[PDB]
Paper text:
The nuclear exosome targeting (NEXT) complex plays a central role in directing non-functional transcripts to exosome-mediated degradation, but the structural and molecular mechanisms remain enigmatic. Here, we elucidated the architecture of the human NEXT complex, showing that it exists as a dimer of MTR4-ZCCHC8-RBM7 heterotrimers. Dimerization preconfigures the major MTR4-binding region of ZCCHC8 and arranges the two MTR4 helicases opposite to each other, with each protomer able to function on many types of RNAs. In terms of architecture, we found that the biological unit of NEXT consists of two copies of each MTR4 and RBM7, assembling symmetrically around a highly intertwined ZCCHC8 homodimer, with an arrangement conducive for targeting different RNA substrates.
The smaller version of NEXT (defined as NEXTS) consisted of full-length MTR4, a truncated mutant of RBM7 containing the RRM domain (residues 1–98, for simplicity referred to as RBM7; Falk et al., 2016), and a truncated mutant of ZCCHC8 in which only the minimal MTR4- and RBM7-binding regions remained (residues 41–337, referred to as ZCCHC8S; Falk et al., 2016). The cryo-EM analysis of the NEXTS complex resulted in a reconstruction with a global resolution of 4.5 Å. The map showed ordered density for two MTR4 protomers (referred to as MTR4A and MTR4B) facing each other in a head-to-head configuration. This density was separately fitted with the atomic models of the MTR4 DExH-box domain and arch domain, as the latter has different conformations in the available crystal structures (Lingaraju et al., 2019a; Wang et al., 2019; Puno and Lima, 2018). In our reconstruction of NEXTS, the MTR4 arch domain of both protomers is arranged in an inward conformation, similar to that observed in apo human MTR4 (Wang et al., 2019) and apo yeast Mtr4 (Weir et al., 2010). The KOW domains of the two MTR4 helicases sandwich a globular density that is, in turn, connected to an elongated protrusion. Briefly, NEXT forms a homodimer built around the N-terminal region of two ZCCHC8 protomers, which intertwine to form a coiled coil and a globular dimerization module. The ZCCHC8 dimerization module interacts in a symmetric manner with two MTR4 protomers via their arch domains, in turn positioning the DExH-box helicase domains in opposing orientations with respect to each other. The cryo-EM analysis of NEXTS allowed visualization of the interaction between the ZCCHC8 N-terminal dimerization module and the MTR4 KOW domain but failed to reveal other features of the complex (e.g., the RBM7 binding site), most likely due to their inherent flexibility.
Numbering used by the authors:
A (entry chain B): 651 to 846
B (entry chain A): 43 to 150, 160 to 218
C (entry chain C): 43 to 150, 160 to 221
Amino acid sequence: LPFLQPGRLVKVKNEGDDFGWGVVVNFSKKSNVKPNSGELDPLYVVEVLLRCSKESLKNSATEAAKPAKPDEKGEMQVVPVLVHLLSAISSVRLYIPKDLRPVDNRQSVLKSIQEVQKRFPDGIPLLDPIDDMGIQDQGLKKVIQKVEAFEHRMYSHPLHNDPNLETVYTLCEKKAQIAIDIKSAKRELKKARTVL
Amino acid sequence: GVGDAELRERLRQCEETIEQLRAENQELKRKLNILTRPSGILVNDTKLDGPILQILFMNNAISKQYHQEIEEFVSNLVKRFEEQQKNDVEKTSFNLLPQPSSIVLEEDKNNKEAFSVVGSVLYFTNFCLDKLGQPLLNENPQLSEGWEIPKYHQVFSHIVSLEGQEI
Amino acid sequence: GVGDAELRERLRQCEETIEQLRAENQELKRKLNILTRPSGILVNDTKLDGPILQILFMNNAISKQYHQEIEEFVSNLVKRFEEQQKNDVEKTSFNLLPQPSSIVLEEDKNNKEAFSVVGSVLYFTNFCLDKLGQPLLNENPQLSEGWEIPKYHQVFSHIVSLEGQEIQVK
């Protein structure tokens, strides 16, 4: 929560699509009004400025979704997102215009996010979970040890050095999805007329 | 004989490596003192008698020709601060500490409220390399020092979610 | 036998000594997190690229409500330097470093003319804690860019030297 200043360059992926990089504009602990089926945990909403599509804005009432596609220039607007969707927190704070609400200054923000990407070609330094936040909770040491172990032997593998790895990765992903599809189809077929 | 000589050579090599590490540590001592803690400082006005900032000037023509207005700026900031009174505006929210990294305590007991630096930002004239965040109370991020929210229009009405719990 | 045992004990002691040194060379970079020098940047210039200055906002300081005027001020300095770029004159205006303590690099191009602390002060309500000083040009404070001398009368003709070393200053 102390790391949510305006400009934090967060990333958002609710399992369907990548919106990209966007600057945070505001956030709040707004709870569920008229809670359906009760309420026992508080939620948080972050008002963050993403790059949406023209078709998404022209209606802007159906699902508030479908970010712009690489075939369209798109337009940027501030969108409310859930707290549990921030898949990356960065350590850079682009300057934000004063009072805003037009077009040209958001275009300048687009330009600014465009040069900043031209300065860290290796990859923006996001954070370090061990020190920057200040976590002193037992168990996270075990998981960081395990991740360090798994990636150690990962690179320690020869296949990794071998080329054409991406092609074989795609092939394995495809055959795994076919296997999943066949599993689901057999699960459905196992109830064609079974004690219905 | 030969084995003993090899063992002695290995021990000497290990000692040389130890010496290099010791020299590196003695070097890094310099870096771990620019934080500074001269001695036990007598302070009375807790949270009003103590350092305000710590500027680290960097090699850039702007930061070595425009110096004097930075010092006058910190000065006019310390003077303009004392012309407000008969108010409770200092914290007003019980602004407890964020999770800091306290400066090393150099010895050359009391004062448990100590410096406990609470932020750091690098300026590159087109962005800000922030770290340690910024202190703020439990919730309601509109009643704390800082956090000047911009003005937005909020044309959307349907928050994104994983599944269910739609606005 | 006895000599071999003594040698083994010495080797174990040396390894332990390195462990202590190994432990310090691991617990230091921890406190040294504040300094970041994040990763490979591409600084194609040294008079307009690179950082400007690093501020350590202090705790227990009621003066932290000014978190915006500082930022807008340090932002208007670059635009004023741009509008005041120069009255074009040929001058090197070079400078060296009194204290070479550059910020550490945990990044697993330039790293000498940039990412180098030139001055660090610890402001107080009225005090200061400078320990590195402004860098000088040809040891003459009369043409440097940062120094500024006050005005004073100076009628004290002829110094008081030590023992028999009277120097005719004027």
